[PDB]
Structure formats: structure tokens, C-alpha cells
């Protein structure tokens, strides 16, 4: 699956355009998860963080989540609860992969929990760097 000389494999965290011209976080998944069909040549199935919906997108239209500050949209983040929720689940997956530790209390708001997570992301995901984001 996805053996085509194009970028991104199953499990890769990426940004994709949807809901307008905004970049939204997602993860490349196997077509098996979509209930559809195998992706067309050069394309990938991605599951959007937050709503968990699926989209078939060309590998040439996706960017690595690692280009974080480049695609994160602060205005959108502040305006939409859905974007903030998407970001939380995205960075939750990111920190699990990279071994980055965060702490929280039951009930702590998503925005509050996101503060240190975004600092880590915008800072370049140190100490691992974007390598720590790999599946």
C-alpha cells in the first residue's frame, strides 16, 4: 500500500487542506480504515484529527506535520473549538511518539493542556526534533 515513490506512509502525521483553504492536522491511514477502496495511485487516505473523518488526498497536496509553525493557524485556533480539539489530539499523538512528557489534572481545559504542547511543537519538538514524530 502506497508503494509509489511518493511521500508519506501509514501512520505519518501530516497537514492537509479541507474546510476551506485551511490546513488541518491528520494522519495517513490504510484504506482498510476508511470503508472505501484503496487510494488511487499517488494518493493517500488520511484521517483528520478531531472529527476522525477520512479524505483521499494526493501525496503532493500533503505536508509533514513537522512543518508545524508553517501550517498552524493561530487565528483559526483562537476562533474554533474544533481546531483546538484537533490540535490537542494531534499533539497528544505527537508527544506519545516522541516520548515527550506533559502533565495535567482531571478536568484541566484542553486550551490549558495545549499551552505547553504548542510551545514544544512551535519550538521544533525538542529534543527529538521532527524525527520523534515518525510512526
UniProtKB/Swiss-Prot annotation:
Changing residue 55 to P: Prevents accumulation in pericentric heterochromatin. Sumoylated. Citrullinated by PADI4. Signal peptide: none annotated. It is found in: Nucleus. Residues 10-68 form the PWWP domain. Required for genome-wide de novo methylation and is essential for the establishment of DNA methylation patterns during development. DNA methylation is coordinated with methylation of histones. May preferentially methylates nucleosomal DNA within the nucleosome core region. May function as transcriptional co-repressor by associating with CBX4 and independently of DNA methylation. Seems to be involved in gene silencing. The PWWP domain is essential for targeting to pericentric heterochromatin. Belongs to the class I-like SAM-binding methyltransferase superfamily. C5-methyltransferase family. Interacts with CBX4, DNMT1, DNMT3A, SETDB1, UBE2I9, UBL1 and ZHX1. Interacts with SUV39H1 and BAZ2A/TIP5. Interacts with the PRC2/EED-EZH2 complex. Interacts with UHRF1. This is DNA (cytosine-5)-methyltransferase 3B. It comes from Mus musculus (Mouse). The lineage of its organism: Eukaryota, Metazoa, Chordata, Craniata, Vertebrata. The chain holds residues 223 to 357 of 859 of the full protein.
Amino acid at each position: 500500500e502506497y508503494q509509489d515513490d511518493k511521500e508519506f506512509g501509514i501512520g505519518d502525521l501530516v497537514w492537509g487542506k479541507i474546510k476551506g483553504f485551511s490546513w488541518w492536522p491528520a494522519m495517513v491511514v490504510s484504506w482498510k480504515a476508511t470503508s472505501k477502496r484503496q487510494a488511487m495511485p499517488g494518493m493517500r487516505w488520511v484521517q483528520w484529527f478531531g472529527d476522525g473523518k477520512f479524505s483521499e488526498i494526493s501525496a503532493d497536496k500533503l505536508v509533514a506535520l513537522g512543518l508545524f509553525s508553517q501550517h498552524f493557524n493561530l487565528a483559526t485556533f483562537n476562533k474554533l473549538v474544533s481546531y483546538r480539539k484537533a490540535m490537542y489530539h494531534t499533539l497528544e499523538k505527537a508527544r506519545v511518539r516522541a516520548g515527550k512528557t506533559f502533565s495535567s489534572s482531571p478536568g484541566e481545559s484542553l486550551e490549558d493542556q495545549l499551552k505547553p504542547m504548542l510551545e514544544w511543537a512551535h519550538g521544533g519538538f525538542k529534543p527529538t526534533g521532527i524525527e520523534g514524530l515518525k510512526p
